[PDB]
Amino acid sequence: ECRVLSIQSHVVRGYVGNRAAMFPLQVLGFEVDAVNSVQFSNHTGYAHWKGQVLKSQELHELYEGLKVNDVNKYDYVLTGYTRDKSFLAMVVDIVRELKQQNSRLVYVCDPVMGDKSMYVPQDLLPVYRDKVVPVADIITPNQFEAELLSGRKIHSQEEAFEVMDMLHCMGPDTVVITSSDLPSSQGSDYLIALGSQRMRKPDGSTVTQRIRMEMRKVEAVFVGTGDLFAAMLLAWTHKHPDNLKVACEKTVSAMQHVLQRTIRCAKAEAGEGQKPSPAQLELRMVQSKRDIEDPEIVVQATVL
Amino acid sequence: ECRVLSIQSHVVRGYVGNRAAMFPLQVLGFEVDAVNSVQFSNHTGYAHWKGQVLKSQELHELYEGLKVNDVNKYDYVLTGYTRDKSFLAMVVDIVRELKQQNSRLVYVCDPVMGDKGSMYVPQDLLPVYRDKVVPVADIITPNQFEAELLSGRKIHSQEEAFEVMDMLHCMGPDTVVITSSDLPSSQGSDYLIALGSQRMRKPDGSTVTQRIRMEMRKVEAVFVGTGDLFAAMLLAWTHKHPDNLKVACEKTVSAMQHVLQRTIRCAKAEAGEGQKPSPAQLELRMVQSKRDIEDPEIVVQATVL
Ligand SMILES: Nc1ncnc2c1ncn2[C@@H]1O[C@H](COP(=O)(O)OP(=O)(O)OP(O)(O)=S)[C@@H](O)[C@H]1O
Numbered sequence: 001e002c003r004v005l006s007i008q009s010h011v012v013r014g015y016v017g018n019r020a021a022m023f024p025l026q027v028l029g030f031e032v033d034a035v036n037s038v039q040f041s042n043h044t045g046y047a048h049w050k051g052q053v054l055k056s057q058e059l060h061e062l063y064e065g066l067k068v069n070d071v072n073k074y075d076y077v078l079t080g081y082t083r084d085k086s087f088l089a090m091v092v093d094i095v096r097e098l099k100q101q102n103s104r105l106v107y108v109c110d111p112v113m114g115d116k117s118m119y120v121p122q123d124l125l126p127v128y129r130d131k132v133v134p135v136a137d138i139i140t141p142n143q144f145e146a147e148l149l150s151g152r153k154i155h156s157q158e159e160a161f162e163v164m165d166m167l168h169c170m171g172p173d174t175v176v177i178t179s180s181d182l183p184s185s186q187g188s189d190y191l192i193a194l195g196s197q198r199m200r201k202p203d204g205s206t207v208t209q210r211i212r213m214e215m216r217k218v219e220a221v222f223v224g225t226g227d228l229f230a231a232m233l234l235a236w237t238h239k240h241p242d243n244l245k246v247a248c249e250k251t252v253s254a255m256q257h258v259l260q261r262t263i264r265c266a267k268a269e270a271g272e273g274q275k276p277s278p279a280q281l282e283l284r285m286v287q288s289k290r291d292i293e294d295p296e297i298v299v300q301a302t303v304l
Numbered sequence: 305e306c307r308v309l310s311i312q313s314h315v316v317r318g319y320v321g322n323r324a325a326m327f328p329l330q331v332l333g334f335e336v337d338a339v340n341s342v343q344f345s346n347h348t349g350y351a352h353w354k355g356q357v358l359k360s361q362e363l364h365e366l367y368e369g370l371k372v373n374d375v376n377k378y379d380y381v382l383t384g385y386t387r388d389k390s391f392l393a394m395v396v397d398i399v400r401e402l403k404q405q406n407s408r409l410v411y412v413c414d415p416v417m418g419d420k421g422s423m424y425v426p427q428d429l430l431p432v433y434r435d436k437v438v439p440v441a442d443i444i445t446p447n448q449f450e451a452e453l454l455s456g457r458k459i460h461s462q463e464e465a466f467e468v469m470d471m472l473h474c475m476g477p478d479t480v481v482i483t484s485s486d487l488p489s490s491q492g493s494d495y496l497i498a499l500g501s502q503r504m505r506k507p508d509g510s511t512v513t514q515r516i517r518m519e520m521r522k523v524e525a526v527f528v529g530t531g532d533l534f535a536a537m538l539l540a541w542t543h544k545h546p547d548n549l550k551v552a553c554e555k556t557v558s559a560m561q562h563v564l565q566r567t568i569r570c571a572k573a574e575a576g577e578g579q580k581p582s583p584a585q586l587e588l589r590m591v592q593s594k595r596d597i598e599d600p601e602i603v604v605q606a607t608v609l
C-alpha cells in the first residue's frame with residue numbers, strides 16, 4: 001500500500017545502495033520500485049571492483065516506461081550515493097513531477113558527499129545545495145555534509161541545531177545529523193547524532209522538536225550504513241510521522257543490532273587479533289532480519 | 305552460511321527474475337549474490353516497457369571482479385530466463401569453474417524456453433540448454449513443453465512423463481520437477497498436475513528414484529514470474545530437505561498457492577467487481593506474503609509413487 005521509488009546502486013555481492021535499502025523496506029512491509037544506478041561486483045572499498053554505471057538518460061527511460069503504463073505513482077522517493085550531476089538533476093526532475101502529481105509525497109535524500117574529505121566531485125555540492133535539498137522532505141547528512149550544505153562549520157550542539165534550522169529553511173522539515181564530532185557524555189567510545197523535525201501548526205507557525213542520541217561506536221569501517229539508516233528511518237517515520245524520537249530510536253537500535261552482529265561475525269571469520277577485511281565486514285543483513293522488523297530498544301533519545 | 309549466486313532479470317516495478325527470487329531466498333536465510341541480467345521498467349505483459357540488457361562480457365567482468373577479490377565462493381547457482389546463447393554459455397563456464405572449486409555446488413536451473421504451443425526463446429538456445437546447461441545442472445524445473453523439448457519426446461501420459469524425466473536425469477540433474485502439465489487430474493479440470501523425481505544414492509552405493517505427483521488448484525489469471533519464485537523456493541526447501549523431495553515440493557507449492565491466492569484476491573479488489581485484473585494489478589504480492597513464504601502451511605500433499 002506504501003510504495004517507495006528507490007534510485008540507488010546495486011552490488012552483486014554485499015549491501016550498499018539498493019541492496020541495503022530494499023530488503024529492510026520489503027521486510028517492514030513497503031513495496032519498492034528499485035532503479036539501480038550502477039551494477040558493480042562489490043563496493044569500492046574492496047581492493048578491486050568491476051561493473052558499469054547507468055546513464056542519466058537510461059534512468060529517464062525507465063521512469064518513462066513506468067509513466068506510460070501509468071504506474072509512476074509513489075508515496076516516497078529515496079536516493080543516496082551519486083557521483084554524476086546529470087543523474088542528480090534527473091532525480092530532481094522526477095521528484096518535481098511526482099510531487100506535482102501527489103501533494104503528500106515524501107522525498108528522503110541522503111546527501112552523500114564526504115566524511116570527517118570529499119569523495120564525490122566538488123561540482124555536486126551546488127546541485128545538492130540549490131536543487132536537491134530544496135525538494136527534499138527528510139535528509140540524513142553527517143556533520144561534514146551539513147556544514148558543506150549550510151556554509152557554516154559546527155563547533156557545538158547549539159551551532160549544530162542552528163545549522164539544522166538553516167537546512168530546514170532550505171526545504172526539509174526533518175533533518176537528522178547521523179554522525180558528529182561533538183563530545184558524548186559517556187566517553188570517547190560513544191557518538192552523537194542529533195535530530196530536528198519542524199512540524200506545522202494549523203497556523204503558519206513552526207514548532208521544531210529537537211532530539212539528541214548517543215550510540216556506541218563499533219570499531220570498524222562499514223559501507224552501506226547510511227543507505228540502511230535512511231531506509232529504516234523512512235519506514236519508522238512513516239509509522240511515527242509526528243514522533244521523531246521514537247522513529248530514530250527504532251532506526252538506531254536496528255543499526256546497532258546489525259552492526260554488532262556484523263562485527264562479531266567479521267572477527268570470527270578473520271583470525272583472533274586480525275583486522276577484518278572489507279569482504280569480511282559486509283553487513284549481516286539476512287541474519288538481522290528480525291532485528292530490522294522489531295528491534296529491541298538499546299538507545300534512548302533525549303527530547304530537548 | 306549458504307550463499308546463492310542468482311543470475312537473472314531485474315525489473316524496476318514488479319516481481320520477475322531476481323526480484324521474485326532474492327526476497328524469498330533472503331527471507332529464508334540465504335545470502336544472495338545477485339547479477340541482474342537486464343534492467344527493465346516492468347515485464348513484457350504491460351502495454352509498454354523500457355530497459356537495458358547486460359552483455360555476456362559484462363557478466364564475465366562482474367564474475368571476474370568477484371574472483372579477483374577471492375569471494376567467488378558459493379553453495380548454489382540459480383538461473384532462469386535468458387535469451388542470448390553467449391550469456392548462457394558464460395553461465396555454464398562459471399558453473400564449471402565453481403564446481404571445480406567446490407564439488408558440492410548445486411546448480412538450480414529453470415530452462416525457460418516456452419509454454420503451452422509457444423517458444424518464447426531463440427531456437428539457438430535449445431541445443432545449448434540440452435548439450436551444455438542441463439549436463440552441469442543438479443536441479444531443473446521445466447514445464448511439460450520444456451521437458452519435451454529437452455528430451456525430444458512428446459508426453460501423452462504420466463508414465464511417459466516419468467520416462468522423459470528419467471532421460472533428463474541421465475542428461476545430468478539428479479532432481480527433476482515438471483511444474484505444469486496438460487495431464488488430467490482426478491479432482492477436476494480445474495486442477496493442475498506437477499510431477500517430481502529425485503535420484504538419491506543410498507549409502508549401499510545403489511541409487512533409488514523417488515517419484516511424486518502433486519495436484520494444485522488453478523488460479524484463474526495469468527501471472528508472471530511464477531517460475532522464478534518456484535525455483536527459488538524449491539532451492540530453499542530442497543536445501544532444508546535434501547532427501548525428501550515430497551516435503552520440499554509440498555512446502556514450495558503451498559507457498560505458491562498462498563502467494564497466488566492473495567494476489568488474485570487483491571487484484572480483483574483493485575479492479576472492479578466483474579472486471580478483468582490488469583497485468584499491473586496481478587503483480588505478485590510478495591511483500592504481503594512474507595510470512596506464508598517463511599513458514600507455509602501445507603495446503604497440498606504429494607502422492608509418493
Ligand atoms: N562504526 C560505527 N559505529 C557506530 N555506528 C555506525 C558506524 N558506522 C556507521 N554507523 C551508523 O551509521 C549511520 C551513518 O552512516 P555512515 O556510514 O556513518 O554515514 P555517514 O558517515 O553519516 O555519512 P552518510 O553516509 O552521508 S549519512 C550512523 O548514524 C550510525 O548509526
Ligand SMILES: Nc1ncnc2c1ncn2[C@@H]1O[C@H](COP(=O)(O)OP(=O)(O)OP(O)(O)=S)[C@@H](O)[C@H]1O
Pocket residue numbers: 414415416417419445446447450483484496498520521522523524525526527529530531532534557560564
Ligand atoms: N495460474 C496458476 N495457478 C496455479 N498455480 C500456478 C499458476 N501459474 C503458476 N502456478 C504455479 O507456478 C508453478 C510454475 O510456474 P510456471 O509459470 O507455471 O512455470 P511455467 O512458466 O509453466 O514453466 P516455467 O516458467 O519455465 S517453470 C506451478 O507449479 C504452479 O504451482
Ligand SMILES: C[C@H]1[C@H](OC(=O)CCC(=O)O)O[C@@H]2O[C@@]3(C)CC[C@H]4[C@H](C)CC[C@@H]1[C@@]24OO3
Pocket residue numbers: 313314315320342344346347348353357385386387388
Ligand atoms: C523483450 C525482452 C527483451 O529482449 C530483448 O530486448 C533482447 C535483447 C538481447 O537479449 O539481445 O529483454 C529481456 O530479456 C530477457 C532475457 C530478460 C527478461 C525480459 C524483461 C523482463 C522484459 C523484456 C524482455 C526480456 O526477455 O528475456
